[PDB]
């Protein structure tokens, strides 16, 4: 059954995908399934830090180490997020499943905050 020329298949698959997508946003969130989600967080973080690594030398020296610290803060933020994800998986169906879901969301909040500060610190270094 070659599907290279089946538009019916394409639209049915597209329809099924929107339903699964809708159900995953309404109905959370089996741990173990967290792993690809946190991976994409770590990947998008890597390209950002590598972007900054090649960008820092074009910025004034008086801002180098204020930027390098916000980098390391984001690294700890990621390893911190990974720690909570593994704890939520260990308690898939226990009293503390909800407890570590909340702590992941706290580490997610900190990633957004400390990345925005990394942006604000770089925006300040540009003002020359």
């Amino acid at each position: 059954l070659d599907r290279s020329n089946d538009k019916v298949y394409e639209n049915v698959t597209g329809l099924v995908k929107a339903v699964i997508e809708m159900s995953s946003k309404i109905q959370p969130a089996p741990p173990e399934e967290y792993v690809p989600m946190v991976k994409e967080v770590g990947l998008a973080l890597r390209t950002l830090l590598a972007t900054v690594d090649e960008t820092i030398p074009a910025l004034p020296a008086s801002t180098h180490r204020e930027i390098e610290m916000a980098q390391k803060l984001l690294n700890s933020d990621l390893g911190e997020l990974i720690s909570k994800m593994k704890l939520a998986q260990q308690y898939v169906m226990t009293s503390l499943q909800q407890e570590y879901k909340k702590q992941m969301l706290t580490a997610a909040h900190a990633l957004a905050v400390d990345a925005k500060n990394l942006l604000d610190v770089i925006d300040q270094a540009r003002l020359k």
Partner: protein, 73 residues
């Protein structure tokens, strides 16, 4: 053609290495038409998540390094 043969031989030797030396291996292959072929000894996502956590130097090779190495035997 011989792509399927050489691709599978790559996945086979990676698997042999993962068991012989107790390793975690991920393999990502994009072809000329940008289709994805991937192999992982365990779970692709776990290996890739474990990859991002690694904030640390290590060995990294590329086609340029390999071509130079094979030009001295």
């Amino acid at each position: 053609v011989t792509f399927t043969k050489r691709k599978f031989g790559l996945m086979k030797k990676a698997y042999e290495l993962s068991v012989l030396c107790d390793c975690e291996i991920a393999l990502i292959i994009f072809n000329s038409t940008n289709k994805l072929f991937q192999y992982a000894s365990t779970d692709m996502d776990k290996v890739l998540l474990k990859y991002t956590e690694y904030n640390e130097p290590h060995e990294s090779r590329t086609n340029s390094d390999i071509v130079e190495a094979l030009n001295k035997k």
